[PDB]
Design an enzyme around this catalytic site. Structure first.
Site, PDB file in Angstrom:
ATOM      1  N   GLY C   9       0.520  -1.035  -0.153  1.00  0.00           N
ATOM      2  CA  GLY C   9       0.041   0.000   0.419  1.00  0.00           C
ATOM      3  C   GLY C   9       1.106   1.564  -0.039  1.00  0.00           C
ATOM      4  N   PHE C  12       1.461   6.186   4.448  1.00  0.00           N
ATOM      5  CA  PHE C  12       0.391   6.452   5.177  1.00  0.00           C
ATOM      6  C   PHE C  12      -0.630   5.184   5.371  1.00  0.00           C
ATOM      7  CE2 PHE C  12       2.136  10.118   3.522  1.00  0.00           C
ATOM      8  CZ  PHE C  12       3.392  11.426   4.846  1.00  0.00           C
ATOM      9  N   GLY C  14      -0.172   2.679   7.216  1.00  0.00           N
ATOM     10  CA  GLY C  14       0.021   2.120   8.469  1.00  0.00           C
ATOM     11  C   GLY C  14       0.817   0.243   7.709  1.00  0.00           C
ATOM     12  N   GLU C  74       9.800  -1.632   4.877  1.00  0.00           N
ATOM     13  CA  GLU C  74      10.663  -0.886   3.585  1.00  0.00           C
ATOM     14  C   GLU C  74      11.426  -1.558   2.565  1.00  0.00           C
ATOM     15  OE1 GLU C  74      10.025   2.926   4.627  1.00  0.00           O
ATOM     16  OE2 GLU C  74      11.655   2.633   6.142  1.00  0.00           O
ATOM     17  N   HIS C 171      -7.501  11.953  -7.780  1.00  0.00           N
ATOM     18  CA  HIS C 171      -7.300  12.834  -6.335  1.00  0.00           C
ATOM     19  C   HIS C 171      -5.610  13.132  -7.613  1.00  0.00           C
ATOM     20  CE1 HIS C 171     -11.673  12.805  -5.181  1.00  0.00           C
ATOM     21  NE2 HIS C 171     -10.930  14.143  -5.781  1.00  0.00           N
TER      22      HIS C 171
HETATM   23 ZN   LIG Z   1      -9.933  11.202  -3.244  1.00  0.00          ZN
END
Ligand SMILES: [Zn+2]
Ligand SMILES: [Cl-]
Ligand SMILES: [Cl-]
Ligand SMILES: [Cl-]
Ligand SMILES: [Cl-]
Ligand SMILES: [Cl-]
Ligand SMILES: [Cl-]
Ligand SMILES: [Cl-]
Ligand SMILES: [Cl-]
Ligand SMILES: [Zn+2]
Ligand SMILES: [Zn+2]
Ligand SMILES: [Zn+2]
EC number: 2.7.1.21
Lengths: 179, 179, 179, 179
Positions: C9, C12, C14, C74, C171
């Site tokens: 993912g 941020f 998690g 990471e 976005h």
């Molecule tokens: Zn959005």
């Protein structure tokens, strides 16, 4: 050695197809598999035995000593009795897969799925697609005369124009009782 | 508005049945749905349009402007080209659901699923049941003459006694090359 | 006996906290647990051993014969070399849990997570919350001067006003190259 | 606009850490977040407001009109009253995340998690690692004098040598009542 898997969600979320998909994996591994469904698929000769029943008690009347995987569909048609039946089968070393409704058309918890969800090793809540907005649905909308069923309309309803569709919580409507 | 869902796992994990289950939810919500599959289901008159193709490029030759949900099965039969095709469709507002193999019989990453897993919003790795021990399987075992295929045996193999079954990593065996 | 779990993912989402949560379960079961992280938590005296490394090769220099559970955070800071390292550790009977980025800021697959996702038994793609609309995010938005980073802006960038935030695909914006 | 997410499982499955991980995603998206816990974490100045309570009724006494995300930990310390509270908050447009025990030490469904699981949009059953065999655990083992608690031993127990650990169903033991 035995465990329980619970598949739930609204009408039209694909619970029955998901139950079958998982039982089919039993067949490819040459396991013996049966499914129970309320009364009122093969590969290399080895097949899912399907069994219609009226009562949860009928399950223990069947010889299950060689059965690896036990399915039970539409569990809302049964009682909390099915809870101890499913715990016993899982303690006797069976993989048990139950499917049924989480809530009724009113949004109320549908016995016996709450308890099964609580005692099961795995829980999968499937979601359909809302017939209104197209987002993830969670609830079963009952319609009577193209209108939202009332909180107190009964489930047995003779001669009525009756439909069901999945909806998101926002688009799900339970109409008030009359007086 | 558009996104990608990726369904993967070994042979016999039910990828195809899971892809169909999710497309069926499209139908109950009155959405238009199609599925693409390699060349070489209805409800209230609204039906999944199934489409056989030889090449990933054929997808864009179809008119998809009114299609809500696009399925693509057995994606390992295609190239990394399908990656940009699937990103474009998702950017044009489609829900896209891809299914195919995570690894080949050797346990090696099967193009183009790695990249699709990396760029997809959702990933579901399905597991079958190991034909040896009955635990969760993760790998496709290829057998030639009741024996483990070799790392270098080709996939095109004429007249050979050939079988496939799901296995856990422990029971999966790739035999060494000869010299 | 050994397997791989992959956590991925955007930034941020998690990932690091989820990796730690799963390693902590190792501690409550009195298992020995370590985590590797890029260089450049206890319960009843038994503790997660944390280890900073520059190179994936350093992992095999450590004595791991008594370690039940190996974490690696990471992973995008390492090479595809970490793939064979993780397969070997899982074949030697370790539970291995890897976390890292699925994509970079451009939306491109981030080596080596594609391959790890393909060869892992389990994959969990975590999603954050979009800083714009508040829906499920999937991508890491890089901003330079309160503006969308360009497809070709480098990652090493001296003296620039630089921020990162999670966004949904809609976005997320990668600005064009200049000429 | 509002929904419910339910996190459950045995003691030591990481329910509390998972609840926090999901609330933290709220903070990175600049959302206002609070968590309620039984009486008896920041990023860029915006912080999870933590609130200790004795009774579920205290929740509605708080001003929640600007709160995006409401957490509630250790829900087994409350009544079925918390069910309507959580439905109302979700209908008022809040994201609500509840965590607590699925079963007690006896393996019995732990009120009010059954109903919450039934009415929630999402359900996540977390599993720990069995302190005996190291497989996936599902149950909380209570020990009194290094021995399995009895089905009828009370929870209030003064001066007793008492421990808890996660176990798989097979290794979980509820000792019989005395007479
Ligand atoms: Zn959005
Ligand atoms: Cl109903
Ligand atoms: Cl599922
Ligand atoms: Cl293959
Ligand atoms: Cl699934
Ligand atoms: Cl990046
Ligand atoms: Cl997770
Ligand atoms: Cl308890
Ligand atoms: Cl989770
Ligand atoms: Zn809706
Ligand atoms: Zn096996
Ligand atoms: Zn155990």
């Amino acid at each position: 050695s035995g465990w329980i898997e619970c598949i739930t969600g609204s009408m039209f979320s694909g619970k029955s197809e998901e139950l079958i998909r998982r039982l089919r994996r039993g067949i490819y591994a040459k396991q013996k598999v049966v499914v129970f469904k309320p009364a009122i698929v093969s590969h290399n000769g080895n097949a899912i035995e399907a069994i219609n029943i009226s009562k949860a008690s009928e399950i223990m009347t069947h010889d299950l000593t060689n059965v690896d995987v036990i399915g039970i569909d539409e569990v809302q048609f049964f009682d909390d009795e099915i809870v101890s039946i499913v715990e016993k089968l899982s303690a006797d070393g069976h993989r048990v897969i139950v499917a049924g409704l989480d809530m009724d058309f009113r949004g109320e918890p549908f016995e016996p799925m709450p308890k099964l969800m609580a005692v099961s090793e795995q829980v999968t809540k499937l979601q359909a697609v809302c017939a209104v907005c197209g987002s993830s649905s969670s609830r079963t909308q009952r319609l009577i005369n193209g209108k939202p069923a009332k909180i107190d309309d009964p489930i047995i309803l003779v001669g009525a124009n009756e439909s069901y569709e999945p909806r998101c919580r926002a688009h799900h409507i339970v109409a008030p009782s009359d007086n």
